[PDB]
Design an enzyme around this catalytic site. Structure first.
Site, PDB file in Angstrom:
ATOM      1  N   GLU A 118      -3.520   0.113  -8.866  1.00 37.38           N
ATOM      2  CA  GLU A 118      -3.832  -1.200  -8.324  1.00 37.38           C
ATOM      3  C   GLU A 118      -4.532  -0.908  -7.011  1.00 37.38           C
ATOM      4  O   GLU A 118      -4.364   0.171  -6.434  1.00 37.38           O
ATOM      5  CB  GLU A 118      -2.557  -2.006  -8.072  1.00 37.38           C
ATOM      6  N   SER A 169      -5.815   4.907   9.715  1.00 36.41           N
ATOM      7  CA  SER A 169      -5.719   5.073   8.272  1.00 36.41           C
ATOM      8  C   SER A 169      -7.020   5.139   7.487  1.00 36.41           C
ATOM      9  O   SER A 169      -7.078   5.788   6.448  1.00 36.41           O
ATOM     10  CB  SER A 169      -4.811   3.993   7.688  1.00 36.41           C
ATOM     11  N   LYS A 224      -5.233   7.117   1.749  1.00 38.84           N
ATOM     12  CA  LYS A 224      -4.882   6.944   0.345  1.00 38.84           C
ATOM     13  C   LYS A 224      -5.135   8.179  -0.502  1.00 38.84           C
ATOM     14  O   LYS A 224      -4.362   8.488  -1.404  1.00 38.84           O
ATOM     15  CB  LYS A 224      -5.662   5.777  -0.240  1.00 38.84           C
TER      16      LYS A 224
HETATM   17  C1  LIG Z   1      -3.838  -1.811  -1.009  1.00 40.62           C
HETATM   18  C2  LIG Z   1      -4.905  -0.833  -0.482  1.00 40.62           C
HETATM   19  N1  LIG Z   1      -5.111  -0.367   0.890  1.00 40.62           N
HETATM   20  C3  LIG Z   1      -4.363  -0.194   1.860  1.00 40.62           C
HETATM   21  C4  LIG Z   1      -4.582   0.374   3.233  1.00 40.62           C
HETATM   22  C5  LIG Z   1      -3.507   0.237   4.328  1.00 40.62           C
HETATM   23  C6  LIG Z   1      -2.134  -0.392   4.035  1.00 40.62           C
HETATM   24  O1  LIG Z   1      -1.303   0.267   3.061  1.00 40.62           O
HETATM   25  P1  LIG Z   1      -0.335   1.219   3.395  1.00 40.62           P
HETATM   26  O2  LIG Z   1       0.236   1.614   2.145  1.00 40.62           O
HETATM   27  O3  LIG Z   1       0.702   0.444   4.157  1.00 40.62           O
HETATM   28  O4  LIG Z   1      -0.534   2.420   4.146  1.00 40.62           O
HETATM   29  C7  LIG Z   1      -3.792   0.818   5.603  1.00 40.62           C
HETATM   30  N2  LIG Z   1      -5.067   1.373   5.831  1.00 40.62           N
HETATM   31  C8  LIG Z   1      -6.132   1.548   4.895  1.00 40.62           C
HETATM   32  C9  LIG Z   1      -7.330   2.136   5.296  1.00 40.62           C
HETATM   33  C10 LIG Z   1      -5.950   0.965   3.565  1.00 40.62           C
HETATM   34  O5  LIG Z   1      -6.825   1.037   2.564  1.00 40.62           O
HETATM   35  C11 LIG Z   1      -5.800  -0.336  -1.482  1.00 40.62           C
HETATM   36  O6  LIG Z   1      -6.690   0.438  -1.133  1.00 40.62           O
HETATM   37  O7  LIG Z   1      -5.700  -0.644  -2.678  1.00 40.62           O
END
Ligand SMILES: C=C(NCc1c(COP(=O)(O)O)cnc(C)c1O)C(=O)O
Ligand SMILES: C=C(NCc1c(COP(=O)(O)O)cnc(C)c1O)C(=O)O
Ligand SMILES: O=P(O)(O)OC[C@@H](O)CO
Ligand SMILES: O=P(O)(O)OC[C@@H](O)CO
Ligand SMILES: [Cs+]
Ligand SMILES: [Cs+]
Ligand SMILES: [Cs+]
Ligand SMILES: [Cs+]
Ligand SMILES: [Cs+]
Lengths: 263, 394, 394, 263
Positions: free
Chosen positions: C108, C376, C86
């Site tokens: 958000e 991630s 992120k």
């Molecule tokens: C909606 C949120 N998180 C998503 C997230 C995801 C899924 O969101 P993606 O946008 O698909 O990459 C995958 N891995 C980690 C470590 C995450 O924090 C948030 O942090 O607000």
């Protein structure tokens, strides 16, 4: 020459030595003094005494608690030396050995420590966390003050160590029963015993885990000049904290049994 | 004897029960051998890079030094896998453990960062890890207790004494003295009996080596001073090591001042202790007049120890390195300042280092100076602790 | 009109109230301009490297693939400053915010990783950040709530609806519609109205670019398949992007299967939803026969969303990318497996990706295959959640 | 041509139009129907109606809750269309406009949706989350079914948008009072009003934040053909959920006051 005279006499009577261990000041100064007189009256050939130290890293729970108790009673090293003076004043011939932690010896000066040991009548000093490798200043100070420097012969000792311990040591050689820390519940050498005698090392006393008459006889049978028991003794002290009378009685009973086993 | 000098001046040595000398001797031999082994170095490097994520970044703080002539960089050990510099030497000690055919690991931990590092390395390298941690720290650094368990490590609470780092150390040593044949004691700081202070420095020196290369490339010159908090001394010596021969570079170690030095509730034996013998080494100790080792204190579990590594005692003695202290409050203000103005949440241990740097700048804002603070770890583990304190204050 | 194609096939668009079109148009213009601006790219790169810690490592998992013909690598986005991928695009969107003269940030968050990333970037770049987070997630991802506050960000619990990601998204949009003149809405995933799916991909594509370079250097060839979990779709498209034109490379997106697809309690609209219009885009939606947007579910807050980015809907439509699902339990087993055998604690979101990879290996253990799982994020934020579940099971 | 006839008549009587807004099915089907008859009897010139949608992103709390209430009463879009049929069966000339969210329109097919609107007598449709930029299929379907496609003229509208809205729109032009979402508490144009008339855009009705007679008069005075009030109306509904009788009474009172202000 308290140790030399003891082992000589013991050798004639063809018996091994029983050396009990207790922490000075546990559970208190007065009671500790009585406990020690009882140990001697019960049959102790020599004494092994500890001085309360904040971090006894070579000790298990039993003796850790012994130290805590002595601290609760405000027992200090100075008071331990006053006790040793009294003990020596009542028993002129019993050999007295101290089991110390390095900082207490180093604190006000190594030489000053051994000078004090000599002044109160102490015969030997074993510093638990000072291997032969760091022993120079300690062994030297000891000898200068007619104190026997005690060295440990671990079960994993190689030839070089056997030889070093043999020549540097005086009084007796502390033969470790096992690895680990002090503890009666943990029960642990003929070859090592033989090598020491070959190199003319001071007589060997086995220690750590010795908590039964059977273990005493075994050590002597194996060639050891005697055995040391600490935790087993200390355990009787803590189990009878409520009844000092039954404490001494239990102690006398136990020491006699352990000593007889050395005959 | 030994292959390497167990002393740094008068400090150091191998003050352990005779039973442990063979283990110490074996460890030293294995370390010396491993240092001349290309394969070992390659395997170590591989783990540090591809597993831990080194090299770590060197971040310039433009916001917190605004309006002063102080340029401040942060060595980001907080970005290392695990969250603290601890992971570096643990990977090396784990390899030494395997090299020696040991299948188990004993480790002590206060901030829990070393515990977590020991657990993850053991999980990765196939070792059975058991960690000693003071009960007080089990509570104030709980996030790490969970992490350790999740990775298959056995965490053992130590209720004895002050129930903190010191006590965890005592138990670890007692345990090792009775299991050295199968277990390797992975000491977590540059202290204890030789060869640990030497091994830990060497397995942490990459911090300073990378810091030097990064500072040269970004500034064209060396730092006026590198600053690190000092618990046992691993992240600080790790940062210092490569700068020692660069005489122009100030080496500043920051000991925890706790509630203040005058209160006696601190962890600053180096500048407010007395030389003694404990935990296998002759080093400055916070101790009573009688020679009893006192209990230390610090809001940060990682610095809460009554002694310090022998090399730091030596460097201070000859005046190569200067040591100062930072109180709890000073560390907290630094913690909040970094969070709000640089967007980095530092470990409370690291915050002590940052606090001194901020003092150096604030006290003489027109003094031109290039400083590097070793941000030894991230503060995720300190969030709840810091929150509760800031709550009771508003 | 617009400067860029708002659609990916039939999916995408700018389905927002007329009042927000100028803001969307301004954002697109600023993005296009920033993409051709050397200074912007340099500033972005500088932040990613020296502040965030990129490039992230690519870790080979030797332990978990033992006895199979599966080689598995993990792209360590879990080592990125903040703890998740992120942080990458947040640094870029923050720069765009400044470029547009906006002084405030609306974001958000579900897993709280985007919230933390938004807060830290805002603290670093001088922006006033406010974060919307569903109340349920405030609880199951609490470690992040604390981190956000500590960095000066305002966290606003959303109790409406399912009190999760979806609801946080709704509030963020409502807020922006009334404050777009001073606040920039830093959407956290590759979804929403154009230009967000495009901007988020582009500001996350470094994941795949680095993964390709790292895999080529370590293996001499491309991966048989890159696997990533799919919430809104940012880490997955970030990983996929650079491999799209490499036809031999399998693109596998893993949607949360929740308690199982047959239970209806999941977050897999892509393979079990129906195209609809919501959150400013025409994309697959979990929705009732009546056209009402249903509430999604997943043990991992980050994947708990009833829709998906439009590009993923497109890639699936033409068959370039395959999407599958992984249940809660499968994600949990993967989480524990990684912790105990590789010494890495993965985010529960990332665990879904790892779970599929482990399935691909276990189901055909003699199939030779090179796989890369985008890890991630780290799972520090999931420790308490996972502990409570594993406790109720033993 | 319900809107054309209304504005023509209103123009002659030299008055503006008052158009109340309510969510169909709130708090229930029966009560919602009575509420609407009262709005008409009280003086409503035209109606603006919403269909409960799971995620009304252009609405604040008041109308969000209106939607929740309708959902609690199990109100579905199908039932909303049955209601519209009944409403049109009782009021043959009042113009009826729907305020929809895109998914509900797109769900079973855009054309099918407008075909249904035509079948029940609906006059116009405003899709809140469909800007002119995405309006093609919607505006086209609307016109094919004689439904007026409604477009919003935001306060930040530029000339190109004014022109687009002018030519694409039918019935009336929704003139936004302010940015943000629906809400009575948030109170918000002469130039924009003039430009629309210049480009021959359908008559303008101001909406968002209109909750007092004063605001109604102001809009008309500024040139607007009328005003729309939703949240203010809905607020009276929720405050009187316990007393349906006092609910209608309060509503009639309020609508009359708002309408008079348009004279
Ligand atoms: C909606 C949120 N998180 C998503 C997230 C995801 C899924 O969101 P993606 O946008 O698909 O990459 C995958 N891995 C980690 C470590 C995450 O924090 C948030 O942090 O607000
Ligand atoms: C005692 C422990 N921590 C020490 C630590 C310290 C202090 O120890 P050093 O060895 O002085 O480097 C500094 N910074 C971080 C982030 C830490 O975790 C431990 O994790 O067990
Ligand atoms: O307690 P023990 O029986 O293990 O003996 C060891 C010491 O306490 C006496 O030297
Ligand atoms: O609720 P209002 O008064 O802001 O009006 C807006 C809508 O609800 C009616 O179009
Ligand atoms: Cs790195
Ligand atoms: Cs500066
Ligand atoms: Cs310290
Ligand atoms: Cs393999
Ligand atoms: Cs999803």
């Amino acid at each position: 020459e308290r140790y030399e005279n003891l082992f000589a006499q013991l050798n004639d009577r063809r018996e091994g030595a029983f050396v009990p261990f207790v922490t000075l000041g546990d559970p208190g100064i007065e009671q500790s003094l009585k406990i020690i007189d009882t140990l001697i009256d019960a049959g102790a050939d020599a004494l092994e005494l500890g001085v309360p130290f904040s971090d006894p890293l070579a000790d298990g729970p039993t003796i850790q608690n012994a130290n805590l108790r002595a601290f609760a009673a405000g027992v200090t090293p100075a008071q331990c030396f006053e006790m040793l003076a009294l003990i020596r004043e009542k028993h002129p011939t019993i050999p007295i050995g101290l089991l110390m932690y390095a900082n207490l010896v180093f604190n006000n000066g190594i030489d000053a420590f051994y000078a004090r040991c000599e002044q109160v009548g102490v015969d030997s000093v074993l510093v638990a966390d000072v291997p032969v490798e760091e022993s120079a200043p300690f062994r030297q100070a000891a000898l200068r003050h007619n104190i026997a420097p005690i060295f440990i012969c671990p079960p994993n000792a190689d030839d070089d160590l056997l030889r070093q311990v043999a020549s540097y040591g005086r009084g007796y050689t502390y033969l470790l029963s096992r690895s680990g820390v002090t503890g009666a519940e943990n029960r642990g050498l003929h070859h090592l015993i033989e090598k020491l005698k070959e190199y003319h090392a001071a007589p060997a006393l086995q220690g750590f885990g010795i908590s039964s008459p059977e273990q005493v006889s075994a050590a002597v049978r194996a060639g050891a000049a005697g055995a040391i028991s600490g935790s087993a003794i200390v355990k009787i002290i803590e189990k009878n904290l409520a009844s000092p009378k039954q404490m001494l009685a239990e102690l006398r009973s136990f020491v006699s049994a352990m000593k007889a086993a050395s005959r | 004897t030994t292959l390497l000098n167990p002393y740094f001046g008068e400090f150091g040595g191998m003050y352990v029960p005779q039973i442990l000398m063979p283990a110490l001797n074996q460890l030293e031999e294995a370390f010396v051998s491993a240092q001349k082994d290309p394969e070992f170095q390659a395997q170590f490097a591989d783990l540090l890079k591809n597993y831990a994520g080194r090299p770590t970044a060197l971040t310039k703080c433009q916001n917190i030094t605004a309006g002063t002539r102080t340029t401040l960089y942060l060595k980001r050990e907080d970005l290392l896998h695990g969250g603290a510099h601890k992971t570096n030497q643990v990977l090396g000690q784990a390899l030494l453990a395997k090299r020696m055919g040991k299948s188990e690991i004993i480790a002590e931990t206060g901030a829990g960062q070393h515990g977590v590092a020991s657990a993850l390395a053991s999980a990765l390298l196939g070792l059975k890890c058991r960690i000693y941690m003071g009960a007080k720290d089990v509570e104030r650094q709980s996030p790490n207790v969970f992490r350790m368990r999740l990775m298959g490590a056995e965490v053992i609470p130590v209720h004895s004494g002050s129930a903190t780092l010191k006590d965890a150390c005592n138990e670890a040593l007692r345990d090792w003295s009775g299991s050295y044949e199968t277990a390797h004691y992975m000491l977590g700081t540059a202290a204890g009996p030789h060869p640990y202070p030497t091994i830990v420095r060497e397995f942490q020196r990459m911090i300073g080596e990378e810091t030097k290369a990064q500072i040269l490339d970004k500034e064209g010159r060396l730092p006026d001073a590198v600053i690190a908090c000092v618990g046992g001394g691993s992240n600080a010596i790790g940062m210092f090591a490569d700068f020692i021969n660069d005489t122009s570079v100030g080496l500043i170690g920051v000991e925890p001042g706790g509630h203040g030095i005058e209160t006696g509730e601190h962890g600053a034996p180096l500048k407010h202790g007395r030389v003694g013998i404990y935990f296998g080494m002759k080093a400055p100790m916070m101790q009573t007049a009688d020679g009893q080792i006192e209990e230390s204190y610090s809001i940060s579990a990682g610095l809460d120890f009554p002694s310090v590594g022998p090399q730091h005692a030596y460097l201070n003695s000859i005046g190569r390195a200067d040591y100062v202290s930072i109180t709890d409050d000073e560390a907290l203000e630094a913690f909040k300042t970094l969070c709000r103005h640089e967007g980095i949440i530092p470990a409370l241990e690291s915050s002590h280092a940052l606090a001194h740097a901020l003092k150096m700048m604030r006290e003489q804002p027109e003094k031109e100076q290039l400083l590097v603070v070793n941000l030894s770890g991230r503060g995720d583990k300190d969030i709840f602790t810091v929150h509760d304190i800031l709550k009771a204050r508003g």
